[PDB]
Amino acid sequence: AEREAMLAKTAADNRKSAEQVAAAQADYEKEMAEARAQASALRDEARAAGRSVVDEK
């Protein structure tokens, strides 16, 4: 049973380590791009507010 579980762990770790490195890279990229998207939306909201204030004034 010990040999069996050892095989099982060798299998999972390799897999889970690979998948978790991939997931860490993907999640860092996703969070960074979400931050960029929020920044772009904020800048566009500022542009819209500026256009609105110039038009109203």
Partner: protein, 229 residues
């Protein structure tokens, strides 16, 4: 005398010498071509009387190229002498580059074996064409123009998708105008894009590109030769 009529007129637009006061008169004669024929009589007369052309074509205007300058036919025989040194440095070969891009696009319309250099030229040309699009009643100061043309000529737009170039440009000049106006002030007062200012502008473009968000049934069978399985 129809030629004389125009020459007698247009030739009076001149840059007087310092002995005569240094004054000047710039002429922007406007000619209506019939059926896009720049090779007619009066058009060619005026073309030969003047120091350049801005051949606005309806085809390019419809294609979304506004102000619609046909780059190849258009020319300014004064050329760089009528540009500030920053603009001359940033756009010295821009017109010939765009003419070559148009020729390549006509040639490379259905060529599937494009070389790397040819495709790079096509991409740079498309980005420049987008960069030169400009809405009406939206003038740009000369410093903004040099920064914009700097984006394309030096290749900082090569990473932006074509359809976003107009936005990228439009945003960057604002980001500079709001945050790094020292570049614009340097260009305006000095009329030159100094090495220090060029480095600052490149760094600004890169830090903005970090934050820029781009818009992007028959069957095969084997006969077993027996009546049933």
């Amino acid at each position: 005398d129809v030629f004389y009529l125009h020459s007698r007129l247009l030739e009076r637009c001149a840059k007087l010498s310092d002995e005569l006061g240094g004054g000047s008169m710039t002429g922007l004669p406007i000619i209506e071509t019939k059926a896009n024929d720049i090779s007619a009589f009066i058009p060619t007369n005026v073309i030969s009387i003047t120091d350049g052309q801005c051949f606005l074509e309806s085809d390019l205007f419809n294609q979304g190229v506004r102000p619609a300058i046909n780059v190849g036919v258009s020319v300014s025989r004064v050329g760089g002498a009528a540009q500030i040194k920053a603009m001359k440095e940033v756009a010295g070969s821009l017109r010939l580059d765009l003419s070559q891009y148009r020729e390549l696009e006509a040639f490379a319309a259905f060529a599937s074996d494009l070389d790397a250099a040819s495709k790079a030229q096509l991409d740079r040309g498309a980005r420049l064409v987008e960069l030169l699009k400009q809405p009406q009643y939206s003038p740009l100061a000369v410093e903004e123009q040099v920064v914009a043309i700097f984006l394309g000529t030096q290749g900082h737009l090569d990473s932006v998708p074509v359809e976003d170039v107009q936005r990228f440009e439009s945003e960057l000049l604002e980001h500079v105008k709001a945050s790094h106006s020292d570049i614009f002030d340097g260009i305006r007062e000095t009329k030159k894009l100094s090495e220090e200012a060029e480095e600052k502008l490149v760094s600004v473009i890169n830090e903005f590109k970090k934050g820029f968000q781009a818009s992007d049934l028959e069957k095969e069978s084997v006969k077993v030769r027996k009546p049933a399985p």
